[PDB]
Design a protein around this motif. Structure first.
Motif, PDB file in Angstrom:
ATOM      1  N   UNK D  33       0.796  -1.217  -0.217  1.00  0.00           N
ATOM      2  CA  UNK D  33      -0.159  -0.035  -0.067  1.00  0.00           C
ATOM      3  C   UNK D  33       0.915   1.318  -0.099  1.00  0.00           C
ATOM      4  N   UNK D  59      -0.494   9.520   0.477  1.00  0.00           N
ATOM      5  CA  UNK D  59      -1.747   9.099   0.744  1.00  0.00           C
ATOM      6  C   UNK D  59      -2.225  10.064   2.038  1.00  0.00           C
ATOM      7  N   UNK D  60      -3.483  10.332   1.750  1.00  0.00           N
ATOM      8  CA  UNK D  60      -4.238  11.156   2.880  1.00  0.00           C
ATOM      9  C   UNK D  60      -3.491  12.438   3.332  1.00  0.00           C
ATOM     10  N   UNK D  72      -3.401   5.400  -5.013  1.00  0.00           N
ATOM     11  CA  UNK D  72      -3.562   3.854  -4.850  1.00  0.00           C
ATOM     12  C   UNK D  72      -3.372   2.761  -5.894  1.00  0.00           C
ATOM     13  N   UNK D  73      -2.807   1.712  -5.740  1.00  0.00           N
ATOM     14  CA  UNK D  73      -2.235   0.806  -6.438  1.00  0.00           C
ATOM     15  C   UNK D  73      -3.261   0.368  -7.553  1.00  0.00           C
ATOM     16  N   UNK D 128     -26.268   4.734  -0.003  1.00  0.00           N
ATOM     17  CA  UNK D 128     -25.763   3.251   0.595  1.00  0.00           C
ATOM     18  C   UNK D 128     -24.917   2.542  -0.163  1.00  0.00           C
ATOM     19  N   UNK D 130     -22.154   3.794  -0.887  1.00  0.00           N
ATOM     20  CA  UNK D 130     -21.163   4.642  -0.629  1.00  0.00           C
ATOM     21  C   UNK D 130     -20.213   4.940  -1.783  1.00  0.00           C
ATOM     22  N   UNK D 135     -13.278  13.715   1.687  1.00  0.00           N
ATOM     23  CA  UNK D 135     -12.948  14.301   2.864  1.00  0.00           C
ATOM     24  C   UNK D 135     -12.370  15.733   2.793  1.00  0.00           C
TER      25      UNK D 135
ATOM     26  N   UNK J  59      -7.335   5.915   8.398  1.00  0.00           N
ATOM     27  CA  UNK J  59      -6.778   7.028   7.640  1.00  0.00           C
ATOM     28  C   UNK J  59      -5.226   6.631   7.588  1.00  0.00           C
ATOM     29  N   UNK J  67      -4.522  -2.940   0.090  1.00  0.00           N
ATOM     30  CA  UNK J  67      -5.614  -2.109   0.141  1.00  0.00           C
ATOM     31  C   UNK J  67      -5.742  -1.470   1.409  1.00  0.00           C
ATOM     32  N   UNK J  68      -6.138  -0.181   1.464  1.00  0.00           N
ATOM     33  CA  UNK J  68      -6.158   0.924   2.585  1.00  0.00           C
ATOM     34  C   UNK J  68      -7.399   0.337   3.355  1.00  0.00           C
ATOM     35  N   UNK J  69      -7.293   0.994   4.656  1.00  0.00           N
ATOM     36  CA  UNK J  69      -8.192   0.780   5.539  1.00  0.00           C
ATOM     37  C   UNK J  69      -9.757   1.203   5.490  1.00  0.00           C
ATOM     38  N   UNK J  70      -9.856   2.266   4.530  1.00  0.00           N
ATOM     39  CA  UNK J  70     -10.972   2.974   4.097  1.00  0.00           C
ATOM     40  C   UNK J  70     -11.777   2.286   3.016  1.00  0.00           C
ATOM     41  N   UNK J  71     -10.731   1.277   2.178  1.00  0.00           N
ATOM     42  CA  UNK J  71     -11.310   0.593   1.294  1.00  0.00           C
ATOM     43  C   UNK J  71     -11.838  -0.668   2.036  1.00  0.00           C
ATOM     44  N   UNK J  74     -15.313  -0.899   3.638  1.00  0.00           N
ATOM     45  CA  UNK J  74     -16.285  -1.090   2.772  1.00  0.00           C
ATOM     46  C   UNK J  74     -16.266  -2.424   2.165  1.00  0.00           C
ATOM     47  N   UNK J  77     -18.470  -4.202   4.900  1.00  0.00           N
ATOM     48  CA  UNK J  77     -19.762  -3.785   4.902  1.00  0.00           C
ATOM     49  C   UNK J  77     -20.699  -4.925   4.120  1.00  0.00           C
ATOM     50  N   UNK J 143     -30.921   0.422   8.103  1.00  0.00           N
ATOM     51  CA  UNK J 143     -29.564   0.787   7.823  1.00  0.00           C
ATOM     52  C   UNK J 143     -29.189   2.060   8.961  1.00  0.00           C
ATOM     53  N   UNK J 165     -20.085   1.857   8.636  1.00  0.00           N
ATOM     54  CA  UNK J 165     -21.478   2.074   8.163  1.00  0.00           C
ATOM     55  C   UNK J 165     -22.064   0.934   8.071  1.00  0.00           C
TER      56      UNK J 165
END
Lengths: 51, 50, 215, 149, 50, 148, 147, 151, 113, 225
Positions: D33, D59-60, D72-73, D128, D130, D135, J59, J67-71, J74, J77, J143, J165
């Protein structure tokens, strides 16, 4: 801290005290037209379609 | 998903809006078909030819 | 529990006369003002058992599109006057009746032979008017039993419903610790021999009857 | 992405400098990552010690207009790479295509005027899934010192 | 826009529709045309309008 | 090109399907056009434009509130809305904005006394911002003093 | 700025006549839209009787009276803001009566601001007019379309 | 109508009239459920005719340029007036091949009606704007002049 | 009907011969002279009729004039000419925190002034 | 009365139910009524609170993962869970090595059973990597974001439990069809043929039976009044 009871008390005044609303440019006697407030749970302000 | 008004479209003018949308359906309609070949676990030669 | 919710609560009805009604409902969830509201629209129209006029034999006329000797109102007008006439039957299934009437005066509604198991609700209905000289009509009316509307065009007009008009409204409401709830304000008009309470209670139990199999 | 594209998208994102642009060609070593390292194999460097390309993915991070920038990769764990191929997509970018916004099912009728005056309805299956999540990032800074005692 | 239109969209000398011409009193009207078969537009129906 | 691709994917040439409502259930009379617009999002969201502040802080020149997007939720009226306001036949809804609750800090604070209970009735005196009319002319080298 | 209704009414019974423009060809402007809410001073229609009254109102009802019956009478006397006795402010019977709820609103009212604002927004409507032979037949010779 | 409501009746009843024009008038807009499609609107099939006529009528004058029959100043005006004669003709050919084109059988068969399609019922009704707007989408493009003013 | 006010004076008397006077001075002065005060001094006024800029310049108010016009000149002008306000119009009242006769205001201003 | 018979069961996820008998205004009604019941009012299972071993706040970027945490939030979910035995359970994802993260490789605690195995939650890149996720689940109805949980707090002492979420609905897609029908001894019936897709979180029979009893629950007041 924000409270649930506050809401209930303020449902009473809304019928007793109106709202005067306008655009960013107003020129006519059709700008400062005022409206009786009514309870809504949504951020963006709902109104009439005629006015 | 989203719903627009049809009322702005003739006052000021857009036909590209009409075309992009009907082609968007067209793009994704062929797209919806190609998934099914893989959703059914079929594959092999056929997917290529479509 | 974690599956249960809170059921609706009526007890806010604007009762104006026996005919019309204006019911309100304070609590209903999101998704549930629009459902039941629209479901019952399509229950309280087709599936509403009542009584109405179907087949009729005129004494001096065979086909509808004619003009009677000494009457202002045409047959096509009078056909519709008969459609709106309100009947209740308890004992029998189908009956044949007669309208023996003559003289200087307005045609009331009572002047029928009150047969066996026949009960009429409304007496002041203007079906027709009779003019100068005496005149005379003796209608051999027939009635059937049904559920929904059947017109004359489909019959290679009957009006089998106690409901006159249906209008459900949906508007927002506020409650304590919540976001949005849909208030079902129901505007109803009846005249096919039924008070507003019984019709809805029947439609609810008829729904319940169908939903009994589902459950 | 846009599914109704144009043709310009492939040149723009590469010549932007936003997305990670591969200068030379070889095979990817260790995808993470954080950072993607790539063996050169083909050419080898001038003085010695082989090629080896390394990419520090951002990132961020923050911009001038109060937003989020995330690289992102794209390419898999140990795959080959050519001279001039996209390795990591930046913020609002995807597989050599400029995304910006998204793909939406859109109808063209009124709905008791919940679309009155060029306004929009939106379904809950939008929110829903997403989809449009962003941000908005803000600098909250402090200075204390600067005295003569 | 959406106000103006809707009213004409209903109030129009419509082409045929399902109906031809079935006569109605007053309170019964709106409904029969809302109920089934009979559309809302039609053209040509006579009424005891009070 | 559109329709041949529409033909490759089993879709109507009209681009119009009569769909059963998810709400009511019934179909429309005419066939509704449906598509994919590729709608996008933009910067100036709710928070940027949305402001509302009751009472608190004030500017350094005059006893008025501040400019915007920094300290007090001012939000100016301009010459345009005043001409509007005057015509709306209302004396108070002008005065409240320009004497009672803006130019006078202390005019607000003696009215903070009067509003809460429900006693009411107005007393202004002098409107503060217009003393800056007087004073800047005084410093110009002209004489202004409230005589008589 | 400061020019407004005060006091009661105009004493003097003089004013400007109301006609249509009658521009060139067909009726560009009729009589009907002109008289709307404008007080009568004396105003004699017919061949010398009564018809219209000394102070009474030309609202909505008496219009169709004077516009469906007695169509031959095109010219009628009408008052104006200038045509009054009292000079500070202006007198109420002189103006006209163009408003919202009930016709004729109360005494002491702005007017000067009504017009100037109601000409304010149509100051956006006009567009500077966007880039807008001598044949000896149809123009030199006058032609009539109707009987 | 609301005029004649408010002119005849008053204040107490006329509020009841106007309200519905909105709430129901919007409810009336959705129930129809019309469309914004490509085939919703129909351009006249004779394109190469009135345009080539407009071309030839001008080419007749454009030959009078090359040869010599008209004067250089009026030559622009005659070419413009002859082009502009067909601009109204194509617009009128549009408006006629659009509005009064139904052809449907009503029980006894063979009958003409007012065509109620997509943008007609935007325009007739009177949503906004005008007909000269619609014509652009449809047939002929509106003519824009040079930066000076002339065409 | 607002523009048609300023006038060149015709006859001689208490008015200044051929100078600049408004409609509100002119008509009142003519009227008061007729059948009580003085016949001859009853002077007519020939019209001076202007546009949006030049006519609005003439304000009886010296608070108000000293805001709209070039205040470079007019605040200094109201000062130089030693002019004293004493007006009852809509201009001066918006400014110094006084009451405009407007709508309900009129009902109070009928009782007050 | 109607009869719930004749279901075309194709896999655990998708379903095609039919209904042979229903009266004339009752194919369209319940058909559309249950559309607006089987979407909002649907008790299911989804991810709520999760404690990372190696990360406290989101973050951030992990050492040896694409894969990032935010990814990944989801990815969690959209994961499907079935619970029979308890109410709320805490589980762990003990995984290590070069290989793609499947879905099964948890300790199958008491009465915990998963429906779908091929779901890509994450990928691991490096050799001697290791993650051990302490996942938690709750039970709900609709939800739920997180704000309503913050409103009602009292005895609160977790920070490490990162919020996702929540998606408490089993239903993916809803489509009811209405067609005319012939049956021995009858006149006319509207056949309700119901085409349904579920996340692997609820079988077709239970959902409809619940929606019918939930309807019955609401209609109990109507019949009473």
């Amino acid at each position: 801290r924000e409270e649930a009871v506050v809401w209930d008390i303020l449902d009473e005044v809304i019928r007793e005290h109106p709202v005067l609303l306008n655009r960013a440019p107003t020129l006519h006697r059709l700008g400062i037209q005022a409206f009786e407030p009514v309870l809504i749970e949504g951020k963006a302000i709902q109104l009439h379609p005629l006015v | 998903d989203i719903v627009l008004n049809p009322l702005g479209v003739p006052s000021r003018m857009n036909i590209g809006q009409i075309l992009e949308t009907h082609l968007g359906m067209a793009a994704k309609g062929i797209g919806d078909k190609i998934n099914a070949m893989l959703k059914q676990q079929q594959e092999v030669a056929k997917l290529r030819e479509f | 529990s974690v599956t249960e919710f809170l059921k609706p609560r009526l007890v806010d009805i604007e009762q104006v006369s026996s005919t019309h009604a204006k019911v309100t409902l304070e609590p209903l969830e999101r998704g549930f003002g629009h459902t039941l509201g629209n479901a019952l629209r399509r229950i309280l129209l087709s599936s509403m058992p009542g009584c109405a006029v179907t087949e009729v034999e005129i004494d001096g006329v065979l086909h509808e599109y004619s003009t009677k000797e000494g009457v202002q109102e045409d047959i096509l007008e009078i056909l519709l006057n008969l459609k709106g006439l309100a009947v209740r039957v308890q004992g029998k299934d189908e009956v044949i009746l007669t309208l023996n009437k003559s003289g200087i005066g307005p045609v009331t509604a009572a002047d029928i032979t009150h047969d066996g198991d026949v009960e009429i609700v409304k007496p002041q209905h203007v079906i027709c008017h009779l003019t100068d000289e005496n005149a005379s009509i003796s209608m051999r009316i027939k009635v059937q039993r049904g559920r929904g509307y059947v017109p004359a065009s489909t019959r290679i007009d009957a009006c089998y419903s106690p409901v006159e008009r249906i209008a459900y409204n949906v508007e927002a409401a506020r409650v304590e610790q919540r976001t949005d709830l849909d208030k079902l304000v129901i505007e109803m008009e009846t005249n096919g021999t039924i008070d507003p309470e019984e019709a809805i209670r029947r439609a609810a139990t008829i729904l319940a009857e169908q939903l009994e199999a589902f459950v | 992405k846009p599914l109704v594209g144009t043709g310009m998208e492939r040149a723009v994102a590469v010549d932007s400098g936003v997305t990670a642009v591969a200068k030379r060609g070889g095979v990817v070593q260790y995808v993470d990552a954080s950072r993607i390292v790539i063996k050169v194999n083909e050419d080898e460097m001038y003085p010695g010690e082989a090629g080896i390309d390394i990419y520090n993915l951002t990132k961020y991070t923050r911009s001038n207009q109060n937003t989020c920038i995330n690289q992102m990769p794209c390419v898999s764990l140990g795959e080959p790479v050519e001279r001039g191929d996209v390795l990591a997509d930046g913020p609002s970018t995807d597989l050599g295509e400029l995304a910006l916004g998204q793909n939406m099912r859109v109808a063209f009728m009124p709905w008791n005027g919940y679309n009155f005056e060029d306004s929009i309805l939106v379904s809950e299956r939008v929110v829903q899934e997403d989809r449009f999540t962003t941000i908005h990032i803000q600098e909250l800074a402090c200075v204390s010192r600067d005295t003569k005692l | 826009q959406d106000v103006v239109l809707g009213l004409y969209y209903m109030t129009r000398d419509c082409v045929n529709a399902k109906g031809e011409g079935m006569v109605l009193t007053g309170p019964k009207e709106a409904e029969r045309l809302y109920r089934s078969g009979l559309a809302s537009l039609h053209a040509r129906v006579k009424v005891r309008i009070t | 090109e559109i329709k041949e691709l529409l033909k490759l994917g089993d879709l109507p040439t009209s681009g119009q399907i009569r769909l059963y409502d998810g709400r009511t259930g019934e179909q429309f009379e005419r066939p509704v056009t449906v598509g994919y617009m590729y709608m996008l999002k933009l910067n100036h969201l709710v928070d940027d434009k949305m402001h509302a502040r009751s009472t608190g802080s004030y500017s350094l020149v005059t006893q008025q509130p501040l400019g915007g997007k920094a300290q007090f939720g001012g939000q100016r009226f301009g010459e345009m809305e005043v001409w509007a306001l005057e015509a709306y036949g209302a004396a108070y809804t002008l005065q409240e904005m320009l004497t009672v609750k803006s130019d006078d800090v202390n005019g607000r604070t003696k009215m903070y006394k009067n509003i809460v209970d429900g006693n009411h009735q107005m007393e202004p005196g002098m409107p503060e911002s217009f003393n800056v009319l007087l004073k800047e002319i005084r410093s110009l080298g002209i004489n202004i003093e409230l005589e008589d | 700025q400061d020019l407004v209704v005060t006091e009661d009414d105009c004493g003097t019974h003089e004013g400007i006549m109301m006609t249509p423009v009658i521009e060139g060809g067909d009726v560009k402007e009729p009589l009907r839209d002109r008289v709307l809410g404008r007080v009568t001073a004396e105003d004699v229609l017919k061949p010398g009787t009564a018809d219209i009254l000394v102070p009474r109102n030309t609202l909505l009802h008496e219009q169709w009276c004077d516009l469906l019956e007695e169509n031959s009478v095109d010219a009628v006397k009408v008052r104006s803001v200038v045509s009054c006795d009292t000079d500070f402010g202006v007198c109420a019977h002189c103006y006209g009566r163009d408003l919202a709820r009930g016709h004729i609103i109360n005494k002491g009212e702005a007017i000067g601001v009504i017009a100037a604002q109601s000409i304010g927004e149509p100051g956006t409507q006009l567009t500077m007019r966007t880039f807008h032979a001598s044949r000896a037949a149809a123009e030199s010779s006058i032609q009539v379309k109707n009987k | 109508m609301l005029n004649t409501c408010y002119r005849i009746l008053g204040l107490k009843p006329t509020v009841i009239f106007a309200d519905q024009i909105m709430y129901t008038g919007f409810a009336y807009a959705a129930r129809s459920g019309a469309s914004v499609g490509i085939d919703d609107m129909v351009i006249p099939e004779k394109k190469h005719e009135i345009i080539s006529e407009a071309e030839a009528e001008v080419a007749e004058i454009q030959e009078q340029f090359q040869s010599g029959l008209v004067t250089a100043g009026e030559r622009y005006n005659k070419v413009i007036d002859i082009w502009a004669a067909a601009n109204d003709r194509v617009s009128k050919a549009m408006m006629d091949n659009l509005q009064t084109e139904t052809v449907i059988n009503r029980d006894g068969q063979e009958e003409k009606q007012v065509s109620f399609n997509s943008i007609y019922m935007m325009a007739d009704s009177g949503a906004r704007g005008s007909a000269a707007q619609i014509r652009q989408l449809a047939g002929m493009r509106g003519l824009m002049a040079k930066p000076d003013g002339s065409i | 009907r607002q523009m048609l006010r300023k006038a060149t004076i015709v006859n001689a008397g208490s008015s200044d011969f051929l100078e600049g006077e408004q409609v509100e001075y002119s008509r009142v002065k003519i009227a008061n002279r007729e059948l009580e005060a003085n016949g001859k001094v009853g002077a007519t006024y020939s019209r001076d009729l202007l546009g949006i800029t030049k006519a609005s310049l003439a304000t009886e108010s010296f608070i108000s004039a000293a805001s709209f016009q070039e205040t470079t000149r007019v605040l200094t002008e109201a000062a130089v000419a030693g002019k004293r306000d004493e007006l009852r119009g809509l201009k001066e009242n918006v400014i110094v925190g006084r009451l405009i006769p407007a709508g309900t205001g009129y009902a109070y201003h009928q009782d007050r002034m």
